[PDB]
Symmetry: T
Subunit: 144 residues, 12 copies
């Protein structure tokens, strides 16, 4: 509230939201276990990727990291399904590279805000299919 | 086969198994998209964890990393369920810290070998519940 | 003015405001002396803090740094007093961690904008009392 | 479009605009050649600058980098000329350091958005004359 | 006492003196809050200083750091006032650079030993006026 | 002259030639402004280049940097035009990669020696067209 | 022998085997000369390789380094010839990438154990022909 | 040819000579395989050398690296044999350390220029015998 | 037990064995005190060793570290005495360097497993006499 | 003696005292063996310590390192026993944290001066019991 | 002699010339003592220089280092005197900055080649007077 | 004088003594020239020293640096001669290593305090002869 910028308190509430999921010691320990497992798995996955896939990851980092540096998801009842379909529709109409990269950043931010890991990775899996249309694949292979 | 150590060819076949999942350019690009999203999400998650949870992650790293440095999952029809229940049974009988840490490393390795992300993170989620019994939580809070 | 974003010139005026305080060579040298003294004192203070206090500082850095990276004070007649009391009132009503961390960042920014060192550190001293209610202390000890 | 923030797609379109200039392999190679030449020239130029000029560059970095971290050009028919004259007019009226530094950052951003190198460096050359009035030179020599 | 060097126990008592100020959890948290605020403010201040002031800070570091590497303040009732006046008197008689730099180091050490932040920064503010006589300013501008 | 190697004095005269362009404080400040702008623009350009173009830049660095480590332009009336045409003629006769890379290094050195930025970047622009014949593009795409 | 693991003494005997080749001061100096020459040559070779070849080297490092981290040659009368032919036969039957990478690691280990440099590099030369069948080349170009 | 320094085009032709050996994809892959093997072998060799041999390598680096920083081999029909014998003759007459170190650098450069690995390492092997006369061994043991 | 590799649980039990020695807070603090003292003493010891001894330590590191990277002690009633005598007997028969280095690594591992510091350093002291026979000393001085 | 500060020669005699223990090559080699073993054991011990014990070690480092940076043992017949008992007596009377930390630093320095490893670690073991009274444990758990 | 570049053997003879001054162990030890003393003195001198002098040193480094990277003294009877006077004469006629910087590099190289330390530093002392004419001082203060 | 430690003002006077030698701009520039020359010469000298001499320098650093970290010369009429002879006399009586190392540190400190470079290096030259008696050479060769 006021003297404080209202946008500011909301941002801080949002940044401390994980704490509502860490109510007991058991919750903390389970989070630690899952993080260890997930982080080891991701580090290992990258270690098995050949340079073709690594260069595609580099391209995504180049554009998504640039924009991000230059400039309902934490709910219990979260509808990735309609967001997916809305995305699919935007992609059939707009054939630019930009909107595809924008979708990647948008979904990534929903993933940051989502406190359910199974839901998060289902979202990533579905939306990566939707984002990788023939148009996106053609851009990525062209500029790599 | 022979002059080569048979264990060696099997290890190399295993390490190149992801390539059977990367058959088309689209498969490569989707993998790149999912990796970007997953890695951003994990980096962001850690950034929101308070020092209590970070110290619990440190403990797991200390023991699991030590052992790992000192010393059916890639299939289509993978049964985490029975592995879980076998683990649950070992934990009711053996109350040592070691077997709990061993389970973490074991499941982490199954996660490395699993080429299906939704299945992998369901496994982590279920098994982290099973591993974090009152006994494990008590150890972790005691030594942190 | 215009072709330039008006927000931009104001931001640049604000960032060069210290220069009005550095009018003579003597002003520059006194600033250098005070900075040396203050910076040595702060480095020394941290060096005498035990790990309990350091972990509490880490928690503040984790959340305040996250928000800050994700997203009248320079006047002669500055009223910390009413700002304090407004803060105190917000804290009696809102018991969230977020608003407490938001207050820390807000007051820190007023401190950045304040060109009077005695006034600045009186502000910090008063407001740190106000921010550290039983609610904030309970959060910080809980998650550390 | 919508579920996506409209500002976001526009930002991503803007960040991928160079790709319209890299349509053929020849375009990529020529860009690589020009970048090598330009970057070698700039590195070499700095290497021949004495400490007086380097300290003036440091001052610009200190204030422009601070603001930038705290917070029609890509067209074919780009009018630096009127922008220059508008700037010249603002500088005759406003004698603050801030507006001069703001002009530097503003023109630098137009340079980032400009996909024509000859036009870009003509812009820099003209506008550096306009920005470096006696007022700006006096500030810069005073605080260096 | 004895087998131990008496100077040694006194030095260790002195180095652990902050702990008498950190008696409760609230005291620890308030210290953490004030340190965060003060350290952010000081880092920000330096970031707004032009190269002239930075070179003056460098000079102080060069001589005070050299001597320090080559080789009543923590009380409740601390008299900066008489120390100031004693300093002022030494400076009217001794016109050397050395005694001015010695005063800086001396007052800095009193600041280290002072467990009251408002008193500390009042001391720095007053004594920086006293140390920066025309003689000191002349030395500093001459050798910079 | 003599006891000194004549080549040596000439090299030192050449390395200090920028100083004739930095006669006034205004000249120093304008140079600082232009350098800031040019360097920001170049850093930004690289940040928007995809991995295809970056690998082409790497190839140029690999060969031009190797040779350079293993082993009239500063005038007012400089004729890039005839140098261009001489280059064009050498390239129609000699189809080797080496002579193309040699041209890049040669023109880069003329750029180093040129104290006029508009002339320099016109030179780079023209000569990059001339160097990037079908032969050069074919080499670069082949070995990348 | 026993209390010691027999595998351990054998491993240590193997690791100190070079010392039988360094019997005189002359042997040490000749080894130093040959190492300098060989290491300079290899560093220089890499420096002349374009990014295409470097990415192929990266692929080999990615898979061979992964397996190696996860998990008769020192004789006078060493038969690379039959080992080659055995390898050739395994490759005609097994078309997997894994067995090709396994051969690389296997031959590399024979090279480590071989104390004759001319024999070692003849082995590498022959076996690199044998390993690089159309199948291996197709894998490597596909995933790069 | 001319406007270009003739020495320069020749140097660039020389630096790109490996490309004539990398005509097919198979040639690139075989080069990558051989480089991996050779580089692993050399890294492993150094790892088994005791400090005596390492200090002898350091001596060669100290003098050969100093000179190199201060300041027919790529043919099909290359005669190391006569070069060896010419070297042997120079060493019988000149007993200085310098000429021995000069031979090392000279042969190392022939090795850089030689595009045949078996021939290169035969050269190194033969010439290291020739260079390591009693005179060279005496120097190296004396100054180590 | 089973689904888990039995070797794995045993390894994890072994790696967490210190925790049985850290049952109370006092045990933790005493361990911290002893570690500080022991680590300071060892760092200080190395700092007083001349380059002769440091090169001998380097030799041990070179061979023991190589093997270790390439590839009853925690009991209350531990018999170093018989292990010593068994070692002494192996050394009278086997005059190789390898078995001496193997003994060093073997005893070092017993030291890692031993949770009694006085017993551990008695072991090291005795066994270092036994390992350093005239044969070992001759090897070490020869190759240093 | 004189022109030299007598304290200085004594300090240098003290710093070279280990050399009287390194009279033969065998003595050097045994020292190298014992250092390797002791240092490996200590590095390994730390690697098995959980974060609780590590934070207690951090506290000791924070205060003992601060004082040490701010500001009969090498004999054959050394009496730790009476020093222990003197310490025990000081601790029963003085309940400050400082004197406990002073004892740690004092005993650590005796350990530095002691050239007998078995005696040194017996000293550490005994004195760590004596220093870790209920008072010290209470301080350390309170501030961690 | 020939197959070897004659310039090369001469360069290597020159680079190993110090060895004629290190004929005995005593010569080596005295060199080590003098180097320690000289290097400590020079490091200490720089540590007492204020930023004015440091910026003048930076200017010399900028130009002398640039030229050196871009591109009778070791005798017993060395005449600095005539070289000085020749330099003095060149400076009265040539008023450019370049020739002054060239003299610095020239004399520095004579210093490198001079194996007598007293003679070397007399040379530096005399020639620094000669080089620092009013013309050089004016350049250096102007561009700093 | 008093409130200030008298030792402190004297230390600061001593640390700023060079400034009396830097009275004019010419003095600053000459100092910069001499420092550049001396520092280049010393860096170059070390680069030509073989590992034997470097290990002797390491030994001096090990002991002199240890003591220095653990714990009339600036006059116009300075008598190195009598100090030398006093040293010579102490060395004939005291045959310890310590007193020789103490002399090195003592003379090094006189060198730090001496503001005349020719006198300083004459001192180093003379005293290095005096310190390097047969006794010192024997120690240094023994422990290297």
């Amino acid at each position: 509230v006021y003297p404080l910028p209202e946008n500011m308190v909301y941002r801080f509430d949002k940044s401390t939201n994980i704490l509502d999921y860490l109510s007991t010691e058991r919750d903390h320990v389970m989070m630690a276990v899952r993080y260890y497992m997930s982080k080891q798995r991701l580090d290992d996955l990258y270690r098995q990727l050949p340079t073709k896939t690594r260069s595609y990851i580099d391209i995504i980092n180049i554009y998504c990291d640039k924009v991000s540096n230059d400039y309902m998801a934490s709910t219990k009842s979260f509808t990735v399904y309609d967001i997916n379909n809305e995305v699919n529709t935007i992609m059939l109409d707009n054939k630019g590279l930009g909107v595809r990269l924008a979708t990647i950043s948008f979904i990534t931010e929903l993933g940051r805000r989502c406190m359910n890991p199974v839901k998060t990775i289902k979202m990533f899996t579905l939306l990566s299919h939707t984002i990788c249309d023939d148009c996106f694949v053609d851009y990525i292979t062209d500029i790599s």
